Design a protein around this nucleic acid. Sequence first.
RNA 1: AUACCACACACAAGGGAUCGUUUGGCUCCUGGGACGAGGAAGGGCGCAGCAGAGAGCGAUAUGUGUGGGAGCAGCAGCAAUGACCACACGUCCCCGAAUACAGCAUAGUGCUGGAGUACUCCUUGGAAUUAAGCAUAUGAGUAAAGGAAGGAAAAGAAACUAACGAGGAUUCCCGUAGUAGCGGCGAGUGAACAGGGAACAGUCCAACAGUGUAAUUCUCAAAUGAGAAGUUGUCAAAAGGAAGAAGAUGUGAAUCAGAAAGAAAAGCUGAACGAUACAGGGUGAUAGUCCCGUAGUGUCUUCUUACAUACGGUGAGUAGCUGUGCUC
RNA 2: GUACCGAGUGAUCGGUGGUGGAGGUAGAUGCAGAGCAGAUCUUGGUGGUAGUAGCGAUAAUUUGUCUUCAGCGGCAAAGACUGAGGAGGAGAAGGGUUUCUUCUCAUAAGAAGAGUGAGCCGGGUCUAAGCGAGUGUGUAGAAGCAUGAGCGAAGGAGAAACAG
Lengths: 112, 131, 89, 51, 119
Amino acid sequence: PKLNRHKASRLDKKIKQKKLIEKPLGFSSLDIIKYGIGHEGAAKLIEEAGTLTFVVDQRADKINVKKAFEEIYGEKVKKVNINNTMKGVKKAYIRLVELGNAAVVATKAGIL
Amino acid sequence: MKFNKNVTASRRKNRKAHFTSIGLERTKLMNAPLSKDLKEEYGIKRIAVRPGDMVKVVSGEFKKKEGVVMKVNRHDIKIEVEGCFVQKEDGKKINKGIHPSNLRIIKLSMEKDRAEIINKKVEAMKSEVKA
Amino acid sequence: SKGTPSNGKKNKRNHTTCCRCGSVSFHKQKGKCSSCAYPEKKMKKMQNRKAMLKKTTGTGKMRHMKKERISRRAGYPGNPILKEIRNKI
Amino acid sequence: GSIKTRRIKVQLVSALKKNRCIPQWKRACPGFKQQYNFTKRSWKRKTLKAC
Amino acid sequence: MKLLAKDLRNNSIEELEKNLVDAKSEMLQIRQKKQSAILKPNELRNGRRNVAVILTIIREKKYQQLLEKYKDADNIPKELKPRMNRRKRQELTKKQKKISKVGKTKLYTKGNKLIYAFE
RNA sequence: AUACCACACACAAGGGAUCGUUUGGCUCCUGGGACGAGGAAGGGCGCAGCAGAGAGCGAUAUGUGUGGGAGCAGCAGCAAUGACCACACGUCCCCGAAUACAGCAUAGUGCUGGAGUACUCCUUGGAAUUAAGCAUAUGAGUAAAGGAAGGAAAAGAAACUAACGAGGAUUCCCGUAGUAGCGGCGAGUGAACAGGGAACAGUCCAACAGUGUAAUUCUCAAAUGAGAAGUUGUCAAAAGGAAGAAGAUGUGAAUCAGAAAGAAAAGCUGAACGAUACAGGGUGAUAGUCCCGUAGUGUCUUCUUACAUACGGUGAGUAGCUGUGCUC
RNA sequence: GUACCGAGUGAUCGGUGGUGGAGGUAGAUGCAGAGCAGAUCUUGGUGGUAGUAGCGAUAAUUUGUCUUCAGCGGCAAAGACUGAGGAGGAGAAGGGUUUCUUCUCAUAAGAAGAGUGAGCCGGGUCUAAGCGAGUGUGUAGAAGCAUGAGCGAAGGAGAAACAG
Ligand SMILES: [Zn+2]
């Protein structure tokens, strides 16, 4: 049925076909994460609450972000919160299962 | 007289074709004559001026001067020659650009692909000259 | 009164952005777009020649149609890896 | 107000990124002839019609 | 390091997929050196060319894998035939256009003529 | 009239007329007439080292191959391990006919839908206006609204004209002609054959298919078998070619010097030289010989086109008639 | 283009001196978008009126002190007012960065940055009055009529959180 869909939260609609050739690796860990953010705002969160902050692709969701972190960086995750900002960027905040490890991962990865 | 009707003789069309040229057509605009001796050393009569070549200025303020080509401005069709400049109120000196056709080549810069460029043109002549 | 004081009550909004044409003209209660007649299959009758030429082919990008003309000029050559399929057909 | 649909939010986000002057380095470029960006707007003088 | 096409064409699909994960890891490292710290303007260009080359060479190798399979078959998959346009695909073959008899001439054929002059 | 108000002239303000110039418009002619379920046309959103708009491009957002070859316009960095350009190909986010749908055909594969519609075909159908008012009539079978197709479309080989000593498909041009006629016989409307030309071409189905055997079309197997359609009737033959046309691209003659003066000579003055090339454009003022071409000459690539069998004289809710409405 | 001077009854024409910096006429004919004071003419620019008319409904303001560089701006001390159907503190519809920090006047002005985190709050669910794809019937095409997938409430119904 045809309707204007002005109240809807998902902008996609169509179901997707198969294809003769398919793209090599698909939506995958290295497409999902963009960069970690390191500034005076973020630094407090590493020092006080054991959480990192990252920019992520618009197509990503909580479950995908959880997997991708455990694949790229290797520490285990307790929680993920998400925030669509006024500048068009999706931010993710990740809390680690043990605190203190946040300062180790941040420094190895050169975020901080 | 022109007898081919596919080629235009409109002032408006000829002018637009000049200023909006790109690619190889732009390179044709930077051609200069060779001196009498070089026209015996090589088959060619004219070539596109490049950095490092040696030129005599034959028209304008800097007539009779000789020098090395420093830079080639393709967008505003001009060449900068070593030692042709004006001094500002500040004492600071600015190179003044000369239009290609007011120059004549005295020695060729043979760096890079120049020797192959020359060979390609000589062969293209003979191919039809000998027929 | 019918002038300035009645202007204060005008805080409802009957039209929103149409998903077919962009033109902020979808009437929510009627279920219809006043620019392009969505959800009807065909596009609306435009009122005059002046107004319809503003939305014709060639007013946008024409992405597909341009490529097709270049391929026709070239003789529809296809992907060079697969020449044998083309030649058989 | 605080309640928004997804379609309204993307319109605001795009309308906010476009609202900027000509960057100061472009003015030095030989071929560049613009003075001021005529597409700049003020919330006090125009409506977006995002509704 | 700037990868070159002719020097990749020698690898298997299994080897080229390994190379892709590395190039993608290197792109992530580049993006971090841009948010954080400072980057030479050349680095992002080079990073991005490397992914595009690997994806181009993979696609060619898969087309060949499909060619060897269907080359001699009936019912070729549509994508292997060139696209043309909708009407060129639906046109009658030149044989079929000339089997009809519906208003063809009896006399007045090309074959019924002589080479003659007039004086 | 010391100082206000007016007019004339010189200088400074204020405004953008005039003259000089133009990578734009308009008109006529010639070519072209190329979209979509393999997801179009149109909309949105992203992509640059510094990047708003516009241009270009899709998460491969300056990739691959071929032909060339010098820089990337600012600042910082890149480049014969290829700057930049031209031809083709690969990749091509979300909404939209938008479809995991609707209708329909075949043994099976499938096809249609939306966009465009200047020109062509089929329907439906005004009023302003003119009659010095107005009602039949006019404007007009025009405007508007719907359906449909192609590079053209429609039409087309006499149930045709004519009364001559006759001609001989259709379309188009000159003409019969503002004529024969239609008309509150008012305003106004209005064809045909001839005679002179452009271009030329004719053919099919039904009525009516071998009966000493459906000889016909399709599928799978196999090297000669099974099965589907069909007796409410299937089946009536040739390859073959050089010509013709349009583009793209290579080459392509012959000049130097001077007083005065100018920011600058190509002007002016003297002496030469080319021409099957004195069309036109660019160079610091008006250039055959300074630069790009032009006349003359080479190459290459596409496209178009061509030989076989059997037949006649009855095609129905039709032609016509009565009533009725529109039309000429 | 601007001052002067001469020629013609006149429409107009010629010269001289400054300004300007690249084009221009005299004779005979050809083609026209071929001459302005007016149209409550069209477009653009400027006067007199005139340093004039006005700019001050509402609770009210003073002193010192620092900046500001000349803001009744900020801070202290007084004097008042709205008076809990408030000129107080919050949500919705509507607006869309107006919010926070720094700098500059350009100031109801700009420029550059930063800022919105949910199993338990609301949407995505149910159904009201009602709307409707397709199908049937109809129409030149439509409208209309019968039936009916799907849709229809950020204040109606609707699993589960509170302090600091
Ligand atoms: Zn619409």
